[PDB]
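Quick question, first post here. What does this chain look like in 3D?
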Amino acid sequence: YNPKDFDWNLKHGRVFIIKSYSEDDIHRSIKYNIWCSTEHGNKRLDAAYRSMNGKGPVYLLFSVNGSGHFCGVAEMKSAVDYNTCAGVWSQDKWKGRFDVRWIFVKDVPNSQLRHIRLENNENKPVTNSRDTQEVPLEKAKQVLKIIASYK
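> Answer (accepted):
Ran it through. Tokens below.
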């Protein structure tokens, strides 16, 4: 993980915040390369992945609720299958699955990112985002640069 020469200067693609309920979900996701969001979240991610048609990346910026930091970045690697076993995740009723590839696995404090605001979310700091909040590409570049470079 954690490449030294990640290209954060995106000219294509879409980027979303993922708010994880538990660090347990992060460990599971890293180990099995899958993720699951809420129904609404899964649908929003599915549409974005399919839209791209493989001609650009869908990035996911992960942060555990209440942690006050981001914990990594993954790329979405499949459409979602809604037809799955329940109880794979910390919210045990959740069904659905898509593949992810983890790129960054590292903790980056919200203090480093909080000055980036999302004009599509009433100009709120990116660090106050809810699950599956999409990020304007020009702001996503700034976040990816900080996460890549943070020591």
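The CA atoms of residues 13 and 51 lie 10 Å apart.
DSSP finds three helices and eight strands in the chain.
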